[PDB]
């Protein structure tokens, strides 16, 4: 799992609404948020309660300050006729031998348009727009320097402290709580699903299964709860009575073995 940033910015805000705004990862979890409004690094989640290094923080919140104006100064480049929307993606992940893999993607429209090719630093892509900002880009000075030195050197190392300081957090695996309920169906049938509450690790695998033969996963759909757990479901059509002779199986971390429900 990698460190990956949330940022997009918009031409046309809701009045009251961040110009700008951005997300901390640590891989599936949050705990960073910011905005222009208020415009402080204030950190979310069990990353409130992480033994913390004190004046980070505020350097977090100079390194997003310095992009929140880069991404405020691109709708200049923008000659068009809007309203505009540019969606950025950041972060590196500590790969083998010690190093990391920067990951810096840009979106117009949520179009992906931008990489930034650290083999010379600078940003890409063939569209017109794409070679206004990043020619605007190359014209902030520094700019692309407070880059590979973001990408390569603070990056990996906001990783390799919080991996330490909180590796917990992470490391923590949550089971799911079941319920197997099912509701009838169009006349002669009934659907079943598979109700799956608050559990971490996201990657969870449901099954389900034919009086003892097997069956396969139904419509499955998912979500996130607010603590920063998880939600899941998925459903399948079977025969009226002939739905007892089913089985449930949840396959997550946070339990020993695949596990059964019964009805």
Same mark, same amino acid.
């Given at each position: +799992? &990698?460190?990956?940033?949330? +940022?997009?910015?918009? &031409?046309?805000?809701?009045?009251? #609404?961040?110009?700008?705004?951005?997300?901390?990862?640590?891989?599936?979890?949050?705990?960073? &948020?910011?905005?222009?409004?208020?415009? %402080?690094?204030?950190?979310?989640?069990?990353?409130?309660?992480?033994?913390?290094?004190?004046?980070?923080?505020?350097?977090?919140?100079?390194?997003?300050?310095?992009? %929140?104006? +880069?991404?405020? %100064? @691109?709708?200049?480049?923008?000659?068009?006729?809007?309203?505009?929307?540019?969606?950025?993606?950041?972060?590196?992940?500590?790969?083998?031998?010690?190093?990391?893999?920067?990951?810096?993607?840009?979106?117009?429209?949520?179009?992906?348009?931008?990489?930034?090719?650290?083999?010379?630093?600078?940003?890409?892509?063939?569209?017109? %727009?794409?070679?206004?900002?990043?020619?605007?880009?190359?014209?902030?000075?520094?700019?692309?320097?407070?880059?590979? #030195?973001?990408?390569?050197?603070?990056?990996?190392?906001?990783?390799?402290?919080?991996?330490?300081?909180?590796?917990?957090?992470?490391?923590?695996?949550?089971?799911? &709580?079941?319920?197997?309920? @099912?509701?009838?169906?169009?006349?002669?049938?009934?659907?079943?699903?598979?109700?799956?509450?608050?559990?971490?690790?996201?990657?969870?695998?449901?099954?389900?299964?034919?009086?003892?033969? @097997?069956?396969? #996963?139904?419509?499955?759909?998912?979500?996130?709860?607010?603590?920063?757990?998880?939600?899941?479901?998925?459903?399948?059509?079977?025969?009226?009575?002939?739905?007892?002779?089913?089985?449930?199986?949840?396959?997550?971390?946070?339990?020993?073995?695949?596990?059964?429900?019964?009805?």
């Amino acid at each position: +799992l &990698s460190l990956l940033y949330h +940022l997009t910015a918009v &031409s046309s805000p809701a009045p009251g #609404t961040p110009a700008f705004w951005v997300s901390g990862w640590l891989g599936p979890q949050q705990y960073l &948020s910011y905005n222009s409004l208020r415009g %402080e690094a204030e950190p979310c989640g069990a990353w409130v309660w992480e033994n913390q290094v004190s004046w980070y923080w505020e350097k977090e919140t100079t390194d997003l300050r310095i992009k %929140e104006k +880069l991404f405020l %100064e @691109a709708f200049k480049a923008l000659g068009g006729k809007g309203p505009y929307t540019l969606q950025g993606l950041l972060g590196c992940e500590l790969g083998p031998d010690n190093t990391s893999v920067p990951t810096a993607k840009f979106a117009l429209n949520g179009e992906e348009f931008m990489n930034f090719d650290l083999k010379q630093g600078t940003w890409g892509g063939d569209w017109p %727009e794409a070679l206004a900002i990043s020619q605007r880009w190359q014209q902030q000075d520094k700019a692309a320097n407070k880059e590979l #030195t973001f990408l390569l050197f603070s990056c990996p190392h906001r990783l390799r402290e919080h991996l330490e300081r909180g590796r917990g957090n992470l490391e923590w695996k949550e089971p799911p &709580s079941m319920r197997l309920k @099912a509701r009838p169906s169009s006349p002669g049938f009934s659907v079943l699903t598979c109700s799956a509450f608050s559990f971490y690790p996201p990657e969870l695998q449901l099954r389900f299964l034919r009086n003892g033969l @097997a069956a396969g #996963t139904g419509q499955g759909d998912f979500g996130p709860n607010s603590d920063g757990s998880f939600h899941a479901s998925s459903s399948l059509t079977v025969k009226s009575g002939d739905e007892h002779h089913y089985c449930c199986i949840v396959q997550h971390a946070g339990l020993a073995q695949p596990l059964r429900v019964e009805l």
